[PDB]
Design a protein around this ligand. Structure first.
Ligand SMILES: O=C1NCCc2ccc(Cl)cc21
Ligand SMILES: [Ca+2]
Lengths: 55, 250
């Protein structure tokens, strides 16, 4: 599943028994209910530029 | 950085400045509040191990504006496979004595998971390379942080396009062969940052080349994807006496 277009995951992808796919996020992020998107859980998550995000 | 631009203050918030006896040594990449990724070759001639400082939130070297945070380097971890004076396995993992405080000007770059980095980030063409290195080959170094956009090459295309050490599976080429744009020797240890779906990731470390922006040559970067597990296991370890530590690789 993860082999093709990162399994739809915005960040990390895990393959499971059958057609089951689990998207995952880097620490400082939480997975949204769409099961593919990652939302920051912290003020300064990794790989985001605050001055660019704030404007 | 050759043929790039000033990185606007705060737009490279993971950039690290490495200092020895207060003098400019190399660049680095903040990957969390305690750990910095740099190049192993940066520590080849270090004698004063206790006088290593990492500065975060740096921009302009001539003025202190209050966004700078300094930390003493507690440990420098280098792979057992790296041979001083050579190009292969050019990675160093640095432990800060105390964590940096994240602010608008101090933010880590994401260390990606291996598979994601190999299958997805490896195919993002352009990435950003940054530092306070030489502005020209045999030129003055920069006072303000510089940034350059570079395209990545498959090792086969790099070898064919290049006019001398081998490009191993632990390296990748990025840049231009026209002599206009490149990272330079004072940029060593700095990031090669890849953007994917609104987030930036660490994919390479400024490593080596045949002179900066040399016609018929590309910049060579450490392939960080080969080191993720090595890095992850080390970040889970307790520090050891002595700053320099040689850890087995794989
Ligand atoms: O001469 C160089 N050309 C390509 C980038 C580079 C990086 C780091 C060092 Cl030491 C030298 C160079
Ligand atoms: Ca400054």
């Amino acid at each position: 599943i993860c082999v093709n277009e990162n399994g739809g995951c915005e960040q990390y992808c895990s393959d499971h028994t059958g057609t089951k796919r689990s998207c995952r996020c880097h620490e400082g992020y939480s997975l949204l209910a769409d099961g593919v998107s990652c939302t920051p859980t912290v003020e300064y998550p990794c790989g985001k530029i605050p001055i660019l995000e704030k404007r | 950085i050759v043929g790039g631009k000033v990185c606007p203050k705060g737009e490279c918030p993971w950039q690290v400045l490495l200092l020895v006896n207060g003098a400019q040594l190399c660049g680095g990449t903040l990957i969390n509040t305690i750990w910095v990724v740099s190049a192993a070759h940066c520590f080849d001639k270090i004698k004063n191990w206790r006088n290593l400082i990492a500065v975060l939130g740096e921009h302009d070297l001539s003025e202190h504006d209050g966004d700078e945070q300094s930390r003493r380097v507690a440990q420098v971890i280098i792979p057992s496979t790296y041979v001083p004076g050579t190009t292969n396995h050019d990675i160093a993992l640095l432990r800060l004595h105390q964590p940096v405080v994240l602010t608008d000007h101090v933010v880590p770059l994401c260390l990606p998971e291996r598979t994601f980095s190999e299958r997805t980030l490896a195919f993002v063409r352009f990435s950003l390379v940054s530092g306070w290195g030489q502005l020209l080959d045999r030129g003055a170094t920069a006072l303000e942080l510089m940034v350059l956009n570079v395209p990545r090459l498959m090792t086969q295309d790099c070898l064919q396009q290049s006019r001398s050490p081998n490009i191993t599976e632990y390296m990748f080429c990025a840049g231009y062969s026209d002599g206009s744009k490149d990272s330079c020797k004072g940029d060593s240890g700095g990031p090669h940052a890849t953007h994917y779906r609104g987030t930036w990731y660490l994919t390479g470390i400024v490593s080596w080349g045949q002179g900066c922006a040399t016609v018929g040559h590309f910049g060579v970067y450490t392939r960080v994807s080969q080191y993720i597990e090595w890095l992850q296991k080390l970040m889970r370890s307790e520090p050891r006496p002595g700053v320099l530590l040689r850890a087995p690789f794989p």
